[PDB]
Amino acid sequence: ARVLVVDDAAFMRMLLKKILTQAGHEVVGEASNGKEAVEKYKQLKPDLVTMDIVMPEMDGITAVKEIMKIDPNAKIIMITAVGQEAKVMEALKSGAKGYIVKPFQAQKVIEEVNRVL
Amino acid sequence: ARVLVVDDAAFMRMLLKKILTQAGHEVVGEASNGKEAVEKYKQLKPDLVTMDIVMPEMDGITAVKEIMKIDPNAKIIMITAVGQEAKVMEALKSGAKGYIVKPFQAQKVIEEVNRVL
Amino acid sequence: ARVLVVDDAAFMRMLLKKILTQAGHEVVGEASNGKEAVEKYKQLKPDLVTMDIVMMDGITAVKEIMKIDPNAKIIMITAVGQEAKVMEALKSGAKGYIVKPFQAQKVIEEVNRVL
Amino acid sequence: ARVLVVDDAAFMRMLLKKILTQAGHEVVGEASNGKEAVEKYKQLKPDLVTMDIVMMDGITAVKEIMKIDPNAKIIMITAVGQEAKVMEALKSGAKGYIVKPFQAQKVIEEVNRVL
Amino acid sequence: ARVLVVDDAAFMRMLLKKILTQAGHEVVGEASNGKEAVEKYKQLKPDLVTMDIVMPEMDGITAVKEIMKIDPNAKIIMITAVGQEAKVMEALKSGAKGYIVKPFQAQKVIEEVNRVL
Amino acid sequence: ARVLVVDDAAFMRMLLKKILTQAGHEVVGEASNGKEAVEKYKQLKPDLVTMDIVMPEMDGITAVKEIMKIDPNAKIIMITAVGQEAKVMEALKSGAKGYIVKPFQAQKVIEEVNRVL
Amino acid sequence: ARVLVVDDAAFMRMLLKKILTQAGHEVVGEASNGKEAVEKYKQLKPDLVTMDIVMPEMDGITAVKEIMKIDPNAKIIMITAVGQEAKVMEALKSGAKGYIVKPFQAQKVIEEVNRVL
Amino acid sequence: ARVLVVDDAAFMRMLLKKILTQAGHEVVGEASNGKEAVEKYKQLKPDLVTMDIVMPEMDGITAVKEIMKIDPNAKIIMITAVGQEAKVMEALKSGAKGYIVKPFQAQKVIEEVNRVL
Amino acid sequence: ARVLVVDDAAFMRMLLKKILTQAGHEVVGEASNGKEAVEKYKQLKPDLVTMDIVMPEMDGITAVKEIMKIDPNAKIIMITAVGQEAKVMEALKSGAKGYIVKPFQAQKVIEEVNRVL
Amino acid sequence: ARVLVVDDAAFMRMLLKKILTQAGHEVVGEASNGKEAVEKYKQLKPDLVTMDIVMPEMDGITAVKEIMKIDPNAKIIMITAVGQEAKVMEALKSGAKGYIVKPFQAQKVIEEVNRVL
Amino acid sequence: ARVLVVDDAAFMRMLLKKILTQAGHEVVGEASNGKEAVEKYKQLKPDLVTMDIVMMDGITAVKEIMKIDPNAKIIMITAVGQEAKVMEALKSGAKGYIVKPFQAQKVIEEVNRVL
Amino acid sequence: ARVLVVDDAAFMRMLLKKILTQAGHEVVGEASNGKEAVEKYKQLKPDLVTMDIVMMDGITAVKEIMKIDPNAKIIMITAVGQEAKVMEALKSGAKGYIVKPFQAQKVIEEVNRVL
């Protein structure tokens, strides 16, 4: 069978891939999160999917909060896309120190890195 | 000057890594999701984190539902960890056909793969 | 001579208690399940524990029904903490589950999905 | 729409029956254990079965008590057909067993042997 | 002229076998207990059976009790077949320390041997 | 450890012996019925006993009855020891055709074999 | 006109061979089971194949039984993988004297060969 | 010792043969299935047989499918017994060109051979 | 006067060696773990042994972690038996790239070596 | 490739070494325990490491027992840290003749050496 | 495209066979030594041969050891069919031999005779 | 009583070692070929040596095949350090070589060049 292997841990995808291949199956693709598994399913139409039941769920804001609990002096720069300004605002409130804009202009990224350090 | 780079898109991590390295910084690690960013922060104690504001949020159950919308005959095997049985149950209800237990015992994985196919 | 009596059936605890008391022993406490027996053991330090096992399981019944009728429609009832068994029941052919305590609307929604 | 309701608790069968009937379904039969559900399935050919699983087990409780007190004295209660579980309980540290239905003299003889 | 020889004492079967063979008969099988004599009769359809009137009668439970009288610290592991669980239970009650399951899986046999020792 | 292996089937003693030896244990003796296990325990004082839960229980009379059910024309000669005359009598009643006496005198055994055939 | 004849019954192969030859065809090969038919097809590239739909295939246990009928003193070692213990047990019961485990450890193979001889 | 080596996998026979020969034994023959092992036993009278406990069985239908993969223009006639019709149907669907029932008339066998060519 | 010095700490072996030599003794060998002390005793037959009671012993997983600290691009294949899957999983998580199973099949060892390189 | 082979069993290192060499790889070193594998890695910078996941650990007490089996007149002094007294006691019971606590005075070490000789 | 594969290591023949087959070639035969390769060549007439023969012999080793130590004690380990070589080894200074397959008892008897 | 065990098969060294040790001897070393046995003899000075060397070479096989078929196509499989032998094999008529460890791609490239 043609198998899509889904797990956030690269090494776990590799272990499962080895077992599946030894049993005669072909791993036709891999994914590390939910959204990616859906897209790869559409594209590859595998006979079978294996999926870790823990898929990454933690949003940027929560990650900022957790890092700030571990280290109140942490320095975090957010990357924004357009339309997510509300979330960046909240990330800054929760302790992030700045942000940079995609697509990256190298000079502006570096200027912001220097300001934050 | 020691930087942890966090983004779900590999090519975006590579572009940012190149800019940071050219400017004299050392990229000491990378992460593609929130949970991984937190763990890598604890472990690496970087001077600086760059973090995409959109981190993967889709849980396993939602990924199962979405795959089932695309293909009502999809064959999906969940991987369970201990303590997540409620979520596996719901994944099965939402259309997953079976599950395998970590740590993997190859013979049982294959037996479950064969039952599902 | 100090005895902790464990059985899920109240009347069976009472019958055993009567026999033990007539023979000169003191029933110092009672329990109706394993977890409760452990707690009472810590607390009472009895000389002796009597324990009844409560044992065809649900999973086998699901398998047997599916052998008789491969199109059988079975909905499991679970409470919180029994999810491992429901998982196995679903794997063995059950089509869904409903949660105790029952919320009528959710029971009916699941009944309709399964039919 | 024809439903076989399976649960060891009578009152839970009645609560589910009420909800199913109010939603327009017919409860065509009831059972309190797996074996009985299989027999009733053959006989009634229901469109749908609801089945409650009845699940810390006795063996784990024996193990936990033995961790707390390696000299604990535990006597299992078995009926005919549960011998596999008693065997495992004895292996996990229980010192004996008594048979239901209880014969007072044999219970006391076993209590004395174990003490 | 085709003879099934039944006796619990090997040397008695050998003496009888020698006499029968010298007299021109063919010993087509041997058995050392009752159950074995019945099975060998079905299978061999001998013209004649010789059978010691004392066949072994001691059940497993009695053998456990007798060993325990000789040595109260004896360590005995029962082998169970399916359907004999009541007898194993009673053997454990009478002083046996554990049991192993046929067919033997070597790792589990050894684990049980180690637990008992 | 020093192990006494008890099982009515020779091949099962050999299989268990192989597993025990591979794990480092020494099989110091074997027995095929209950009575023999007790005697060997006394004599060998093993650290450990393995014992099949089904030990032969069927007496001579039952074996005669069972053989006669299988083949009403079966020809069975009993071997008697002194003191077991009641059992031989019952074996004859249940369909055995004769008996021979231990210790064997070859001539008398053969005379009885010829009478019965 | 070049024909491969496939049937598990030798007599049926002989009858078909005779008829085909009398009609002017050349029987270029024969096979008595499926696997053999495939191999002979690759190798001989016949114009035509005749093939029985049912080839009955003798398993290891049956082969042990048949060899033991031919020679009651036969010495047979089974080659097994892990997980086949029920079948090994049955093979031993039917008269096999031992077993060796794949993948092979040469030392253990030889040890088992020596024990059996 | 003189050894008959029985295994369906050629490479496994070769590995066992090498180990046996290095230890000083003589592999006097090989077989790849049960029936062949029996015949070789009769003929060679080996001191010892090594025999894989699982022989894989290719059925007629699979053999037809495999031949058709090797040569899509293969010409196959199912010469079979009555009562197999579902399997013959499937063989015909999988590419077999003909069928006859045994016992047959020579004339009709040849007529079917001619139709198929 | 011929002394074997046993201690896991190199500095402690050096200090003891110096003191023993200054006092007129000859240090004929050193060992840093138990197994090594035994072997060196057999071989050197010293008049005297000094021995630390506690030698801490590094397991496979710790060795993987330590090698990965020294060289983050290290390529490590674990050698495991069946039943150790939890430990292999952890070794892979700690940075090992694969595993091979004892007893060795040479072909699979090489296949895994090639995959990892 | 250049390979470092790590396994506590010499014979297992030799089997793996043979397979690797036959396939064209170079075994550049060997180790029998974790600590030794780390040191050899630093020194050899191999392309690849094969490493048994379980390293067996001989403790000091076992090493004392083993030495005493080899030579019942062995002279062993336990040079140890404070807080180990139960284990030293057992070592003395198992035949060690002396003990000193580290850190020590040279003079007292030598005095204990002299007492034991 | 028809290939004869020659290598003394079975697993190396198998690896090369797999690579050749994946590339579209047919492995028509195998051999593990030179003499066997020649015979298989005659018989199979392959388009192509791959060959890895891996080749100091026992007799030379005996001679060299005897030069180093004229009192050396050497036992040859031989199978049937190698008697000419054993003869020569004994002439060159070896003191005995043991025959494969080994009986432990005969090995020990020969070791004792030679010492 | 101090024994050097010489055999190209690891498992045969191990079997002989076990028998020798059970009989009271000490195996002080092992070797898998002649040259190694000589070196180990010098170094260990054993009381006793057991030796099984098992020895047509590749070059002769090439020559014989070329006599049978002057258009034969032969590829040598070599490791590093055997270049002198490959040279001679090519001179005697072999058309190419492949180097261990194999890369599949290089094997195929060489097979295609030679055909």
Numbering used by the authors:
A (entry chain A), B (entry chain F), E (entry chain F), F (entry chain A), G (entry chain D), H (entry chain B), ...: 2 to 118
C (entry chain C), D (entry chain C), K (entry chain E), L (entry chain E): 2 to 56, 59 to 118
Q: What do the authors say?
A:
Here, we present single-crystal X-ray structures of CheY from Pyrococcus horikoshii (PhCheY) in two different crystal forms, and the protein purification, crystallization and X-ray data collection of CheF (PhCheF). CheA autophosphorylates and subsequently donates the phosphate to CheY, yielding phosphorylated CheY. We observe PhCheY to have a domain-swapped, pseudo-dimeric fold, which may reflect inherent properties of the protein fold but is not likely to be of physiological relevance.
In striking contrast to all of the known CheY structures, PhCheY adopts an open conformation in both crystal forms, with the two subdomains of a given subunit directed away from one another. In both of the two PhCheY structures solved in this study, two polypeptide chains assemble by pairing the N-terminal subdomain of a chain with the C-terminal subdomain of the other chain; i.e. the α3/β4/α4/β5/α5 part of the fold of each subunit packs with the β1/α1/β2/α2 part of the other subunit [Fig. 1(a)]. In the case of the C2 crystal form, there are six molecules in the asymmetric unit. Four of the subunits (A, B, D and F) interact with one another in a dimeric-type domain-swapped assembly. The other two subunits, C and E, interact with their own crystallographic symmetric molecules for the dimeric assembly with swapped domains. Superposition of the N-terminal subdomain among the different subunits A, B, C, D, E and F reveals that the C-terminal domain of subunits B, C, D, E and F undergoes a relative movement of up to 57° with respect to the N-terminal domain. In all cases, the rotational movement of the C-terminal domain was calculated after the initial superposition of the N-terminal domain. Therefore, a physiological role for a domain-swapped dimeric PhCheY has to be ruled out.
